[PDB]
């Protein structure tokens, strides 16, 4: 037996906010910024350049057609909250 799917890594560097996904690189990976899917965005790392507390904030879902565990991720500032 092996260990499953880990959890998100939110790194922030002034202008930008990086988003290391819990999954693998897979290429077939889908990124979803709250219902609305992300246009051909595919690596485990998402760089939300010049982040806005209204525009770039929200619910995030990284999923492959494998780990459809559909593991959310909240944002703005306090990640994984109400």
């Amino acid at each position, epitope marked *: *037996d*092996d*260990a*499953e*799917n880990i959890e998100y890594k939110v790194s922030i560097s002034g202008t930008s906010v990086e988003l290391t996904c819990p*999954l*693998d*690189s*897979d*290429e*077939n990976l*889908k990124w979803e910024k709250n219902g609305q899917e992300l246009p051909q965005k595919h690596d485990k790392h998402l760089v939300l350049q010049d982040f806005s507390e209204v525009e770039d904030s929200g619910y995030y879902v990284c999923y*492959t*057609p*494998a*780990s*459809n*565990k*559909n593991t959310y991720l909240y944002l703005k500032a306090r990640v994984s909250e109400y």
Partner: antibody
Amino acid sequence: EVQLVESGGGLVQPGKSLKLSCEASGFTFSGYGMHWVRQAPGRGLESVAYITSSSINIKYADAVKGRFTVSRDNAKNLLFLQMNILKSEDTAMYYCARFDWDKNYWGQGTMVTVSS
Amino acid sequence: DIQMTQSPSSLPASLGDRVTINCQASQDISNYLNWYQQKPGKAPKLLIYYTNKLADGVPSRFSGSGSGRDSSFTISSLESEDIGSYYCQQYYNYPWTFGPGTKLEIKR
């Protein structure tokens, strides 16, 4: 264009061993999660194992969980299935596959038969 | 680990008629359901992905329907080449649980 080739199946006696080896062609295999699927005659279709692009997460179907072990070589674009302690349940045809969201890549498959 | 119910497991039908196949899972699959056309010895072709969504170069007539814990599939008007096994499969969790296997029998 996106050709896949399952290699080395055939007969085996019970509780033995077998290494199945798919070959990728026409894609960035290196960074694509892969599946191993079987069609157990009569009994129908079954998913066997899944291994991520970087081999970080491996997922097995309950029936084989244990005795079977998927692996990959991203240089020679090879997907291997390491079946051991074989049963008559494990008597099926095996295909290796790339499962996209809209696409589906299956190989020709190799027929594995387990009888004493 | 989910489970699929296909009804019927033999559908003898005349040509060019509303052929309907039904799929049913244990718990919710949330539309992550596929349909396939396995003809003769070799590999199953994908027809419909995410239930509603029709795949690339699949005849207009084929219609993937049903949601939640259930689903269906419908060849609008069964043509000559559509003869062979049909499978539903789910993609909500690994292992992908596969359907039994409906076989299309051409009524002559």
